[PDB]
């Protein structure tokens, strides 16, 4: 038996009894996911270039590969009939569905996460929140602060050499290939679980006159082990999401903690460190600010920053003991 | 005009008045890139887990990526009757081509380059360098033994986002996109220079304890800069053919020296460093071991190690300078 | 709103209430038939003729597409969880389903319709029918023999200049187009209904020395109109999927009545006859043997044949007076 | 050895010794087909329906399929270089290519033929003839007015359950299968030989009403085989490409002769017949206008039409011998 993504999706909505709310929510990010990995890979892109000439498109129409992926998630989701608040990394207030399209899910998103990697063609992806709406209040920004804790279900897709969606939900992650041959995400790794202890540590070092001493501690001892064992490799491709994968895949250590230009860390965290701090806990890893859980963390701004290290339980809670030891 | 590599070739071919042999060899390559690409984007994987029956593959005899890589290059290479001998990373010895098949050029790969990325799905790529036979004996490995500097073609393939070709010869460097909804490359950049001086350094620096007191050096400017300016940003994908487009197409330094651990450095002078050192060269760019240039070496074994410097000439001046006042 | 054909099918059977069984398998179909599409269409082709060696494939495995398409279609409707016993043309018997995946619907198809039409590359199709399991005895052939106004759903899937699926339930038919790119069928016409009167007849006339008196009659009127008005332009593509599916995008009739060489017709009833019988009549067209519905007819061997005419009502109606004439 | 279309064309670009401009034709030619197998197969349609919003271009200002095979053709083409007049169906003038891209060939095609099949799905293809300038004068519509003996190349794609280019030239026609995975189109069949005679019979039975005797006697042979064999099968799918490519392959005849009603036949002589008569002879067959063979007609309007009647030697030679009896 083959498994692909939408089977699954459904047949776990049936063990839970849902009404297939849910369930269409999932498999509209199903469609976006797929919608947006072929852009990514620039099918008809000669288009662009003038295979045809120049009359397709009038006066001005283009998009951005990151506006486009906006687009496709908000449209996308909004036709599930499933949500009612959107929050996207691109719009500076939460998005309220119109009612007649409204349903009771909360979705937080990062539409194509990895900017800086865009224009040299490394791997980028997408990042995945869902909250169930708490209140029968009118929806408003409020129904996305809730903590990590809360999240129904979580994820992301990596356009890398293939593409990927991860799927955690309350009983653990699996990984799903998509097969751009006939659009079906194929479930190819089931009940994912991370490596207690990797070899590999992930983080930009660019910023090295900026961090703390248990970073700086903790780095130090990845390259000059007190046991004398082999150093840890570094890696760090510069975009989360395929950081992040490596991190799941391999087992390591992936950080962005805080730095000047950033004091309480650069990456968001209702869009890229819940969602990555929830497959990483169901997965059996870890994820910490340094100081507290991610998932703990109640935001009280949609676009709030959090420093996040995660990864294998090993090594994080190691660095954990590094900030209890200074502290 | 749109502009294919097809054409571009073709007309690069009558502009050198060349016989047709080695457009015929080119076209063969871009050919291999497209099938590797779809194969890697994992196309009719859905076939692999079962999908219309016969589940006995599930313990997997079946090739791997780079085998199949491996095995469309070669093939297709011996089809376009254009070459004598070829080395592949994945072939203990040079390849000579059948005396029905035989052509003049010589040609070294690496059918696919980041195998440490290939499950973790991570930008991977396809390397290769072309040659003349100079020798009128006997096609042997000898005819490998060419040093870089006399190339007349050399590129890569990253696998990717997107799959791009950039092909370097001797009147510069172009950037090809491919477009998979029509099997055509793109020309997107053409006749491409890289910037005088870049903002990103990358190297595994796990392997900080075994590093020259040069590279230690440099690796500490970069963080921690005598004149205050603004650090540099630290990337390693841990893909050579990544880590090199970044660094051809954002600016900056791309890093494998020797550690003491391993003194001829890792990275492989004939499909490695050879092409990556000739198309930076033509982009304006600079490839130096720290103490010769890249492209002067002359080869002794199909499969010798060379440490590698490449990327921004004022970055790879400057460790070059660090170099040399280590006397 | 955009609407993928599996938003409608999952939004459908929540109208319904149905347990999502049933939306499984029209899940599973639409799965099936993307795979078949993407086989039909020669995605891969260059590995059967030796674009990497051939050393894929072991001792001899090959699949000819009929043979492929129906392992698609048994694999993926077994993995459904949803069907009792399934018919093919393919098969001489009807197949039970083993137990641990059995559910309640039985399902009669054409893997791949219109064989004579392979080898050069004209239109095919596939074709389903699906009844619920009436009886509580163990499965058996018995509950495929049902007639065909007892179907739940049916429709057909065109492999032709693009790919399209049709669906009819019992409140009406929708066409998706398969979007390649994406993977996904996108609906494109809703609730369709079929012309009244067509201008277009298709038919075999190669068998004109054995057709019936009524047969002859009509095809002449056709010819040679009474009331002199424009004479019905000839179509017969030779697959019925793409007659069929012109008939009703266009108007006008399709016959295959009986001939010396079939007397009792040559198209099979429960997965040629039966199926596109249903989807005239919930567009408003008709479907008789000349002598009777063919939805009527309750068969008595699941690879029966019958006669059938099928059409705009005013055609269809007009020939079946000239048969209630000669009787 | 895999040939692929751009290799075989290579090739015989060498031994024939061209600059290499004729064979940059070719190679254009291939691209613009698989550009327009992509639009015709339906990828990206989903943005059409309105998948990442913007969805005011429901009444449809946006170009046709034939538009913009249109478009292609003529652009990819002037980009060759090769040419300096095309005539198109579309165009109701010859198009004279700026003297800055002009080439020496002159080109007539049918960039999407079978149009009355666009809505239904049926197979629909695309129609080409080529020639040389003999002419020294400024180029012009007369340059295009050479009949079809003097081609130097003509072919055909056909759009159908898959693409095929088939492409004959002075020494024979070949086929190659369009493996829409990678883009590359593939040997298949190798200098194609229809056979002396066949079993089916393709033409619009519809107007039987204006058929000259001739044509009317001979359906009557085969339906009712004086000889009492078996009756000849009928097949008329209404694509010329898609009936004419059934005719190669199977073997029989196709017909457009002149009714009463259009007395030249409704086939264009430069773009359709020509061609298609072309391909015929060239593969063994013959086309015949019923008293001339097509070829060799002095075509005087680039829109002139011919009646057409190509297949089978032996099937055509029996219709050639009742046009004679009928004196
Ligand atoms: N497809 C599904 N996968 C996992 N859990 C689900 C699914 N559908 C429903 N559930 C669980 O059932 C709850 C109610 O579902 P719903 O009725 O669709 O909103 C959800 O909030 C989930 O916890
Ligand atoms: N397509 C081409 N692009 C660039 N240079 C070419 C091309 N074809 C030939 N040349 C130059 O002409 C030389 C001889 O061509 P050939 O006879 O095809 O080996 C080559 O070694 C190249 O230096
Ligand atoms: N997706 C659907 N579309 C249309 N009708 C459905 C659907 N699902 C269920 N039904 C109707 O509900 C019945 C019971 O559904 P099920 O519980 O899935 O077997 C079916 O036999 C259909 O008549
Ligand atoms: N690729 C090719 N295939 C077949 N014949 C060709 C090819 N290229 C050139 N020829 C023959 O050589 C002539 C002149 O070639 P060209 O100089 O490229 O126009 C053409 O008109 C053809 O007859
Ligand atoms: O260049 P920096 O500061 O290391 O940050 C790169 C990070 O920023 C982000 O692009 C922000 O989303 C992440 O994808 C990635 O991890
Ligand atoms: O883990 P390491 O030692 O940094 O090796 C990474 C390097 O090895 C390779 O995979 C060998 O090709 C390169 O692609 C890459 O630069
Ligand atoms: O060649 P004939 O006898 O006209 O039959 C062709 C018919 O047979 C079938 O191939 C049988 O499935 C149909 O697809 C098609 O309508
Ligand atoms: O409906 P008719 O008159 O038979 O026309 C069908 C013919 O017309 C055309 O569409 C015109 O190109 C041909 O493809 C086809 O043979
Ligand atoms: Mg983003
Ligand atoms: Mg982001
Ligand atoms: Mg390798
Ligand atoms: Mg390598
Ligand atoms: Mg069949
Ligand atoms: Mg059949
Ligand atoms: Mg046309
Ligand atoms: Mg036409």
Do not use: W
Request: a neutral charge; aromatic letters at 8%; hydrophobic letters at 40%.
């Amino acid at each position: 038996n083959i498994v692909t993504l939408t089977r699954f999706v459904m047949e776990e909505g049936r063990k839970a009894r849902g009404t297939g709310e849910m369930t269409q929510l999932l498999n509209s990010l199903c469609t976006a996911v797929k919608a947006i990995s072929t852009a990514v890979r620039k099918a008809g892109i000669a288009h662009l270039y003038g295979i045809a000439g120049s009359t397709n498109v009038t006066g001005d129409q283009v998009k951005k590969l990151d506006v486009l992926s906006n687009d496709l998630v908000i449209n996308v989701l909004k036709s599930s009939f499933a949500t009612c608040v959107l929050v996207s990394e691109e719009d500076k207030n939460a998005i309220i569905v119109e009612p007649e399209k409204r349903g009771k899910y909360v979705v937080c998103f990062d539409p194509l996460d990895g900017s800086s990697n865009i224009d040299c063609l490394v791997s980028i992806g997408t990042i995945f929140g869902i909250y169930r709406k708490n209140s029968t209040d009118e929806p408003s920004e409020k129904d996305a602060l809730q903590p990590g804790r809360n999240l129904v279900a979580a994820g992301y897709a990596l356009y890398g050499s293939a593409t990927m969606l991860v799927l955690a939900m309350v009983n653990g992650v699996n990984c799903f290939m998509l097969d751009p041959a006939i659009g079906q995400f194929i479930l190819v790794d089931r009940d994912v679980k991370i490596k207690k202890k990797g070899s590999i540590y992930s983080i930009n070092e660019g910023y090295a006159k900026e961090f703390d001493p248990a970073i700086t501690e903790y780095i130090q001892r990845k390259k000059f082990p007190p046991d004398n064992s082999a150093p840890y490799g570094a890696r760090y491709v510069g975009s989360m999401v395929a950081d992040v994968h490596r991190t799941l895949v391999y087992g390591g250590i992936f950080m962005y903690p805080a730095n000047k230009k950033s004091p309480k860390g650069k990456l968001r965290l209702l869009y890229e460190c819940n969602p990555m701090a929830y497959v990483m806990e169901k997965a059996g890893g870890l994820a910490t600010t340094g100081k507290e859980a991610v998932l703990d963390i109640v935001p009280t701004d949609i676009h709030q920053r959090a420093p996040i290290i995660l990864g294998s339980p090993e090594d994080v809670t190691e660095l954990l003991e590094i900030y209890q030891k200074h502290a």
